[PDB]
Amino acid sequence: TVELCGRWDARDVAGGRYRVINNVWGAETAQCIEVGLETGNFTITRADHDNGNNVAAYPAIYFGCHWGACTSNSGLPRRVQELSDVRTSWTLTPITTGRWNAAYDIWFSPVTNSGNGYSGGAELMIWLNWNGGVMPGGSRVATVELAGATWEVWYADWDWNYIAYRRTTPTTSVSELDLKAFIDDAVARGYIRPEWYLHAVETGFELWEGGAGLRSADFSVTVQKL
């Protein structure tokens, strides 16, 4: 494996299909992750974070295009209305300390260029596990049954629509989770427009405080067009 401690360190994995990023975007506190280059599996080996109410980092693995950097032949970006199926699998190892979450982060925007972010788009999160009392952004607007589980729907109207689905009870893994189900729900709520593009499907850990010991494994994402 290889260790990445750099703030914006990254590594292509799984033959280029996915990409792992240390992504310490909100703090100067140290953070390293040990990455398996074939699977993209990684363990947070070090996290000195103590960022209070603000996220310090989001080490993650993704499929598609993150701020312009795209994985290989992801078939993304692609219009929501042109998607017929979107699936993902993941296995996380929680810890008992720190303030963090284990969740998907999925980006959408009206344009195909993501080099400058997703302003005017949407950010769809799916929280599977957490600790330290951390909470989603915005406020809970509903609780709905989707893709085999029940989720609290949190919404925040920022520069882009922030929609977070928080499982009513924590879990440590999903196998072929029907991501299109969450996407359709956000569209029905008018939080995501069908014309918008799906840019990337990512999962990892939003870290506020600590985080060492968390592990991301068995990542998989597939997208089927109409």
Ligand SMILES: OC[C@H]1O[C@@H](O[C@H]2[C@H](O)[C@@H](O)[C@H](O[C@H]3[C@H](O)[C@@H](O)[C@H](O)O[C@@H]3CO)O[C@@H]2CO)[C@H](O)[C@@H](O)[C@@H]1O
């Ligand atoms: O690396 C390229 C660009 O990265 C930008 O940082 C972003 C992170 O890459 C991204 O993971 C993070 O996503 C946040 C989201 O903003 C927040 O609303 C949500 O609650 O949590 C997500 C995961 O923690 O967003 C940041 C910034 O939006 C840099 O800002 C940019 O300079 C850099 O080019």
